[PDB]
Amino acid sequence: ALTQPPSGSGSPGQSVTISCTGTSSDVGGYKYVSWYQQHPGKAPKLMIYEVSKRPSGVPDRFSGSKSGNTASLTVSGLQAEDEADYYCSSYEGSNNFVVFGGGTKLTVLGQPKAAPSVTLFPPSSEELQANKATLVCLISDFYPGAVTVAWKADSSPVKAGVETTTPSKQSNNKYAASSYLSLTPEQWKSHRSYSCQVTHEGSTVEKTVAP
Amino acid sequence: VQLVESGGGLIQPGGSLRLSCAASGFTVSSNYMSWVRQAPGKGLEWVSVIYSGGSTYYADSVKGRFTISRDNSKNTLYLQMNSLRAEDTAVYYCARGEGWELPYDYWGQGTLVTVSSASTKGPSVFPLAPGGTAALGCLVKDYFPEPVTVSWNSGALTSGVHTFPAVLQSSGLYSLSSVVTVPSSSLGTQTYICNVNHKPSNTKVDKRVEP
């Protein structure tokens, strides 16, 4: 096994170093350490191979080294686009056994804060006719990625029947998430309103729908 | 260099699937090629390799069950996967090289393999609707497996469209939403139809959205 810290972070223009530890049977024993950069939804990209060599097109600010049983990847002049999951790999000396470390998620600090946009939809007529009801709360364009969603019936908190996604970055490099509240048709029709409230960096947004 | 994979899908445990990797810009019959897989939310795992002269190697967890091969005249690499287990669920990548002396510079786009006895279930599509502007949408409910894609007006409407990542419900089915904001004056003047494509069930659902 190759051991990588799960997370790393640096601010723009600075340097960061990610480590990958193994044994004399792989990192310490050969010069066959590679480093891969992976963005969500994309295949990995080769950054470094044979400990310190760079493929064509890979910028000079990525550099690889190793000392003993630990290999290191250094990114200097950090840029926002360096935000990615970085995997180290090594050959183990037998039967083409190539092992990957667990990956280190590198966050680059300093992206501007951005408040969430929220759209809330009531259940459709056709869904109510199927004896079901779903409220749909869509949350987009926020940064950083941590949000808190609270559902309310009238003014009272509702925690049962809630499913909320883990926020993920969209093409605009800001986060989106959604929350779904399942109700019976009777609950929907019998309350004055339902609300979806989103809390983010000490600020709150809320939308309300009614039958 | 291009590597285009196909063949993934949902298969029951104990079943078989053959993955393909179509190559151009080099000759598969004279090169090293590997398969590498990535389980949902996890890291990379090497699977298999074929050398330029035809020698093959496998990770211990797939030996005797998986077979790597190539068709010289079709310039294509294959992975035959038999006796599949839930543990084999992953995105499978083909990559040129063997991971150490020839690192993975070129990768395929990945193909999704889901190993489960759960039924394929096509989505139920419900409208999301209310001068000014109007947010219109479609709720794509209770489908399996991934993926679903959403177009609007058979792809002619793209500006302002946002399709959200799916939520995994406790039932084990997925739901997602797609939304677009339009001038309220254009409702009843123009037609908005969401096209919900679910290739795993060979079904497309076209739902007209109108208040």
Numbering used by the authors:
A (entry chain L): 3 to 9, 11 to 27, 27A, 27B, 27C, 28 to 95, 95A, 95B, ...
B (entry chain H): 2 to 82, 82A, 82B, 82C, 83 to 100, 100A, 100B, 101 to 126, ...
Excerpt from the publication:
Neutralizing antibody responses to coronaviruses mainly target the receptor-binding domain (RBD) of the trimeric spike. Coronavirus S proteins contain three copies of an S1 subunit comprising the S1A through S1D domains, which mediates attachment to target cells, and three copies of an S2 subunit, which contains the fusion peptide and functions in membrane fusion. We found another type of ACE2 receptor-blocking anti-SARS-CoV-2 antibody in our analysis of a neutralizing mAb derived from the COV107 individual.
The heavy chains of both B38 and C105 are derived from the VH3-53 gene segment, whereas the light chain gene segments differ: KV1-9 for B38 (Wu et al., 2020c) and LV2-8 for C105. Accordingly, the CDRH1 and CDRH2 loops of both neutralizing antibodies share similar conformations and contribute more to the antibody-RBD interface than their CDRH3 loops. Among a large set (n = 534) of cloned anti-SARS-CoV-2 mAbs against the RBD, those derived from the VH3-53 and VH3-66 gene segments were over-represented. Thus, they are functionally equivalent in terms of V-gene-determined mAb classes. We suggest that the key feature of the VH3-53/VH3-66 mAbs identified based on CDRH3 sequence similarity to m396 (Cao et al., 2020) is their CDRH3 length (11 residues), and these mAbs will share the C105/B38 binding mode, not the m396 binding mode.
